[PDB]
Design an enzyme around this catalytic site. Sequence first.
Site, mmCIF file in Angstrom:
data_model
loop_
_atom_site.group_PDB
_atom_site.id
_atom_site.type_symbol
_atom_site.label_atom_id
_atom_site.label_comp_id
_atom_site.label_asym_id
_atom_site.label_seq_id
_atom_site.Cartn_x
_atom_site.Cartn_y
_atom_site.Cartn_z
ATOM 1 N N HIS C 88 0.833 -1.183 0.000
ATOM 2 C CA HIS C 88 0.000 0.000 0.000
ATOM 3 C C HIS C 88 0.876 1.244 0.000
ATOM 4 O O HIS C 88 2.103 1.152 -0.026
ATOM 5 C CB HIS C 88 -0.916 0.008 1.241
ATOM 6 C CG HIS C 88 -1.799 -1.209 1.393
ATOM 7 N ND1 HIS C 88 -3.047 -1.286 0.780
ATOM 8 C CD2 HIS C 88 -1.640 -2.285 2.198
ATOM 9 C CE1 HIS C 88 -3.600 -2.392 1.223
ATOM 10 N NE2 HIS C 88 -2.789 -3.027 2.082
ATOM 11 N N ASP C 91 -1.327 8.869 -0.842
ATOM 12 C CA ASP C 91 -1.246 10.027 -1.693
ATOM 13 C C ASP C 91 -2.113 11.095 -1.061
ATOM 14 O O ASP C 91 -3.282 10.852 -0.737
ATOM 15 C CB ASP C 91 -1.752 9.626 -3.086
ATOM 16 C CG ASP C 91 -2.244 10.805 -3.920
ATOM 17 O OD1 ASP C 91 -1.742 11.935 -3.747
ATOM 18 O OD2 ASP C 91 -3.127 10.582 -4.780
ATOM 19 N N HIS C 93 -3.822 14.702 -1.463
ATOM 20 C CA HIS C 93 -4.186 15.721 -2.457
ATOM 21 C C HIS C 93 -3.694 17.107 -2.055
ATOM 22 O O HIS C 93 -3.702 18.040 -2.854
ATOM 23 C CB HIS C 93 -5.698 15.769 -2.660
ATOM 24 C CG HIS C 93 -6.196 14.740 -3.613
ATOM 25 N ND1 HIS C 93 -7.459 14.728 -4.157
ATOM 26 C CD2 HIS C 93 -5.561 13.665 -4.144
ATOM 27 C CE1 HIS C 93 -7.552 13.680 -4.981
ATOM 28 N NE2 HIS C 93 -6.426 12.994 -5.012
ATOM 29 N N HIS C 128 -5.706 9.162 -0.244
ATOM 30 C CA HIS C 128 -6.095 7.789 -0.577
ATOM 31 C C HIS C 128 -4.907 6.919 -1.008
ATOM 32 O O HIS C 128 -3.882 7.445 -1.448
ATOM 33 C CB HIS C 128 -7.157 7.804 -1.673
ATOM 34 C CG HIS C 128 -6.694 8.418 -2.958
ATOM 35 N ND1 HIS C 128 -6.031 7.737 -3.952
ATOM 36 C CD2 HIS C 128 -6.857 9.679 -3.435
ATOM 37 C CE1 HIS C 128 -5.822 8.578 -4.991
ATOM 38 N NE2 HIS C 128 -6.307 9.779 -4.730
ATOM 39 N N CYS C 129 -5.010 5.611 -0.809
ATOM 40 C CA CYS C 129 -3.946 4.736 -1.216
ATOM 41 C C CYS C 129 -4.007 4.759 -2.746
ATOM 42 O O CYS C 129 -5.089 4.946 -3.330
ATOM 43 C CB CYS C 129 -4.194 3.328 -0.660
ATOM 44 S SG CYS C 129 -2.963 2.061 -1.202
ATOM 45 N N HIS C 138 -7.989 -0.300 -4.341
ATOM 46 C CA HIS C 138 -7.655 0.158 -3.022
ATOM 47 C C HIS C 138 -8.568 1.264 -2.551
ATOM 48 O O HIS C 138 -8.999 1.265 -1.373
ATOM 49 C CB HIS C 138 -6.213 0.609 -2.944
ATOM 50 C CG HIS C 138 -5.213 -0.523 -2.977
ATOM 51 N ND1 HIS C 138 -4.384 -0.754 -1.908
ATOM 52 C CD2 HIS C 138 -5.088 -1.534 -3.881
ATOM 53 C CE1 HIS C 138 -3.776 -1.897 -2.161
ATOM 54 N NE2 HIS C 138 -4.173 -2.399 -3.341
ATOM 55 N N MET C 143 -9.971 2.500 1.340
ATOM 56 C CA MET C 143 -8.668 3.044 1.680
ATOM 57 C C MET C 143 -8.516 4.512 1.315
ATOM 58 O O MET C 143 -7.754 4.876 0.416
ATOM 59 C CB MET C 143 -7.544 2.200 1.084
ATOM 60 C CG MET C 143 -6.239 2.421 1.804
ATOM 61 S SD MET C 143 -5.083 1.045 1.627
ATOM 62 C CE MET C 143 -3.978 1.370 2.918
ATOM 63 N N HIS C 248 -27.016 16.936 1.300
ATOM 64 C CA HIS C 248 -28.181 17.730 1.630
ATOM 65 C C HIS C 248 -28.640 17.376 3.032
ATOM 66 O O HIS C 248 -28.835 16.212 3.364
ATOM 67 C CB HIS C 248 -29.312 17.456 0.639
ATOM 68 C CG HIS C 248 -30.620 18.055 1.040
ATOM 69 N ND1 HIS C 248 -31.001 19.321 0.668
ATOM 70 C CD2 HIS C 248 -31.616 17.579 1.826
ATOM 71 C CE1 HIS C 248 -32.171 19.609 1.209
ATOM 72 N NE2 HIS C 248 -32.564 18.567 1.913
ATOM 73 N N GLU C 272 -29.030 24.471 -0.640
ATOM 74 C CA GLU C 272 -29.969 23.448 -0.216
ATOM 75 C C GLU C 272 -29.204 22.147 -0.445
ATOM 76 O O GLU C 272 -29.159 21.288 0.432
ATOM 77 C CB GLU C 272 -31.278 23.509 -1.023
ATOM 78 C CG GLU C 272 -31.153 23.226 -2.515
ATOM 79 C CD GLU C 272 -32.459 23.385 -3.266
ATOM 80 O OE1 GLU C 272 -33.486 22.828 -2.842
ATOM 81 O OE2 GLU C 272 -32.456 24.068 -4.298
ATOM 82 N N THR C 273 -28.528 22.056 -1.586
ATOM 83 C CA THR C 273 -27.750 20.885 -1.956
ATOM 84 C C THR C 273 -26.529 21.411 -2.714
ATOM 85 O O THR C 273 -26.595 22.463 -3.335
ATOM 86 C CB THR C 273 -28.596 19.960 -2.865
ATOM 87 O OG1 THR C 273 -29.791 19.594 -2.163
ATOM 88 C CG2 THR C 273 -27.856 18.713 -3.237
ATOM 89 N N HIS C 299 -28.329 13.579 -2.010
ATOM 90 C CA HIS C 299 -29.639 13.855 -2.633
ATOM 91 C C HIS C 299 -30.074 13.138 -3.895
ATOM 92 O O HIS C 299 -30.937 13.635 -4.618
ATOM 93 C CB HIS C 299 -30.004 15.350 -2.694
ATOM 94 C CG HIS C 299 -31.446 15.635 -2.406
ATOM 95 N ND1 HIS C 299 -32.478 15.356 -3.281
ATOM 96 C CD2 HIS C 299 -32.029 16.177 -1.307
ATOM 97 C CE1 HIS C 299 -33.615 15.716 -2.715
ATOM 98 N NE2 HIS C 299 -33.381 16.217 -1.527
HETATM 99 CU CU LIG Z 1 -3.785 0.217 -0.306
HETATM 100 CU CU LIG Z 2 -34.979 16.706 -0.525
HETATM 101 CU CU LIG Z 3 -6.341 11.282 -6.042
#
Ligand SMILES: [Cu+2]
Ligand SMILES: [Cu+2]
Ligand SMILES: [Cu+2]
EC number: 1.7.2.1
Lengths: 333, 333, 333
Positions: C88, C91, C93, C128-129, C138, C143, C248, C272-273, C299
């Site tokens: 594994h 990473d 971001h 994330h892996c 993964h 992960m 939402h 709202e969303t 939603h």
């Molecule tokens: Cu992994």
């Molecule tokens: Cu709704």
């Molecule tokens: Cu990524």
Amino acid sequence: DISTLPRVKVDLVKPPFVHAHDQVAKTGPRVVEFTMTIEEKKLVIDREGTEIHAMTFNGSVPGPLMVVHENDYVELRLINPDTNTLLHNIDFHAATGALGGGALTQVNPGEETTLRFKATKPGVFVYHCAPEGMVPWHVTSGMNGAIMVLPRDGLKDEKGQPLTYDKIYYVGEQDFYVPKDEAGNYKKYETPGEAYEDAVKAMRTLTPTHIVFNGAVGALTGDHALTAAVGERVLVVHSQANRDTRPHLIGGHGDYVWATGKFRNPPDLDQETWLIPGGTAGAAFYTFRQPGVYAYVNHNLIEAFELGAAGHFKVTGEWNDDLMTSVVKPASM
Amino acid sequence: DISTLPRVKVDLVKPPFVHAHDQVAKTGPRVVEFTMTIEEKKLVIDREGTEIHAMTFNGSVPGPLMVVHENDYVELRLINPDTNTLLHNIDFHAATGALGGGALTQVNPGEETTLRFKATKPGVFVYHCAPEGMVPWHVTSGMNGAIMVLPRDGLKDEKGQPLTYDKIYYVGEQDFYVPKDEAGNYKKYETPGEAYEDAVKAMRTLTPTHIVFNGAVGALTGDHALTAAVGERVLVVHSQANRDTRPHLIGGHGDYVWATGKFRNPPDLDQETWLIPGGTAGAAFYTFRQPGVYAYVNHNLIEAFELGAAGHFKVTGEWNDDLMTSVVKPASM
Amino acid sequence: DISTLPRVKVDLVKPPFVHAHDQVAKTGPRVVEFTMTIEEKKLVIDREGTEIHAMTFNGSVPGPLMVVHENDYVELRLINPDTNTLLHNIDFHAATGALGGGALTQVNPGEETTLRFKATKPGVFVYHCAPEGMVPWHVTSGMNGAIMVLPRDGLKDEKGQPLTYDKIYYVGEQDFYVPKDEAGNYKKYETPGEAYEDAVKAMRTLTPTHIVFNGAVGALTGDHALTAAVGERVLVVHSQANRDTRPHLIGGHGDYVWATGKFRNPPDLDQETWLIPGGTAGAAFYTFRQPGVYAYVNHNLIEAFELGAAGHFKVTGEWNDDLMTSVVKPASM
Ligand SMILES: [Cu+2]
Ligand SMILES: [Cu+2]
Ligand SMILES: [Cu+2]
Ligand SMILES: [Cu+2]
Ligand SMILES: [Cu+2]
Ligand SMILES: [Cu+2]
């Protein structure tokens, strides 16, 4: 404090039209009374006579657009006549508390209720039925619509200046999941309840069989195209209570767009295509500059032209050759 | 009025590259002339030799990026040679009227036309084929591209300060729906027409078989990786004419991003991933700070790594330990 | 330089909760140290006992939320015990270079590594892996997690005025693709690798079998519902490392929303969303005004109520009838 507020009773109009209203509020806060009758009915959604059991607010898909101003009180009388077979309710994304009102408005066939809430936030919001346990089934059966809460001083552009629309249309996009047999033929049922088990299975694929505007393929085309004339400022409200959409005016643009529909935010300018998340209502403002036919579509071309998300706009006026023209080639300088 | 305007002919370049242009306009409005020839041809889209009948603008998928300045007039000579079998046209999301030009550009094999339109709004836009009745098919077959309309005074950041890029690349993402047989083996056809019936059946599933950058899996990897050097400001125009995408530069960011690609709006800063709605073109600005390989992908990783929406960036320069360093290299516990 | 910076060891807490931290940096830049152990384990993801081989960071899905301040240095010690079967990595971001750190942290069972990077950009990012070759496997196995880089001066609103949350919650949405047999029965495997072949096939359908908050259907409901009180300002960090989602809060709103989670950008108001793109983390700020049960859902009501992306909030306080009230409770017409 509320007894000193004027009360007005408004009659709703079937989409894509909207009831009369003032963009800039001429009176102080009011109690706006609306009445909506729930109607479960069979609806033919395409050219091939595919029929479904629609669950509607006021007999249409989508429900009518309601318009009020920031800080007005919305008082809704929700009626579920005895002719219906299921329990329904209403959830407004504009309201605060009790699951948007859904927890307070559960009505069985033969029951009615009146809910009141303060429209504290400006913007266009989605409202939809949401019965405990069968939420996605009622919504994807067309039981959804929108409410616009206009700022008291109307719409404003990126720089705080007034934006006034001459026309307003409400386009409700609906994703349907009709069950088919082994070959792919659409099933028909006697009652809504009978379709339930199949409906659930169809929804779980997450792939709509139809995606329409105003309840049917071509509902907004031909003699039903939306109209306007060169020079007019048009506001197009667009809602999608369950699935993402990306509206686009072929041959035009969205000059001022509130993709997520909240008016306290400055609009986005010159949008070609904008995303309206599922469970959201959005609004686009545009001034027509050329006459002709315009297609209003969900820009996932397959969904627009294969599944049904496409409408028309018929605009009258004079052509502006400076903007566009088919060139004649008799020259070199 | 146009008659007295300077004209400049520009020879288009195949993506990911872009034709010579100026960010800041050194002259007044001009009539920029482009010529595009339609080519229908077989294209291999994956390592397994899958083949499709591509419909291209100028022999590539996507078509070439056209670049002009706000208020210039775009004059395009579209030629559909007699070797082709289908009727085609073009719709510019940057144009106002006649369905973006589609209604004025329908050409059968053996015909050509010259359209002129005013680039009134700044930003990056999608342009695609849209024949009445077979729109999705023409778009999903690779008949799409983008046009950039730069503000006459170049790009600006959030604070209105100039932004200048040293390199500009154009990535057009394409969703393919290759028909399959009972076992799951991709079909092959003799002509585009033969494939039609099956193509529609494949499209309606809303599930792409391939999603690739620049026309094929690995089109931008290995010896085709996009390149840059620590310190350079790069602008990446990305377009998707039919389906949502979410670009991401693994190892970097989008310092200034115009997700919906309209330059009159301020960019969004420090984006890790941004959404480009189908039928739109976006643009990200980034200044490389570390050398090495970077993967430019569609962050639905299944779509990026299984379906093909992944590209590379090979960047040169000296490593910066302040920004990142392995304090303890992987070793047995 | 670094040798001089004060260091702080942080003790991680399992989601949806967050470890101790200051909104407003009380000191200058520091080297914040974290330790996470990788654990592959069987996980029951629904009421029906569906089991899967989860790959986790610190034994949870999602991995814990890590919080630091702009310009702090994050030093993560990553351990892969010999009880695990796969290789594994991680990473971030939020990092710059080496594929987000993924290229510098590949550890096989029985190995560990220590990575250091500078948090140069403020906002909530996804981590994330991402092993070369099995990236989506993964990630879709749970992960992944998030890391929040707060501005040294805390959060600000659309007008630059300070926003202070009283409670903060971390909701990690996870899309699962559990393989099925002919009948539709989910498969069980002895080890991760046995599941691999079937996994890839399931992933390519692009249709999840489960979409859940915090690792399982109903993981944030009943006795595990999120809690708050009327008057409290709550910040909800939401992530999705591979697929789009549209959060939402039923009965509420997103007062201040950073849909793409980057704090240098002003927040969108009254949402709202909102749409959070796959491979992104966002943040919504709300102040509760009504007591009761609130549902925090995706939603797309199908993905929410049928697939499992639905959580709860239980709020305490006094009901405000001005905001909403039942004028007429449901009864026979
Ligand atoms: Cu992994
Ligand atoms: Cu709704
Ligand atoms: Cu990524
Ligand atoms: Cu209902
Ligand atoms: Cu064509
Ligand atoms: Cu288009």
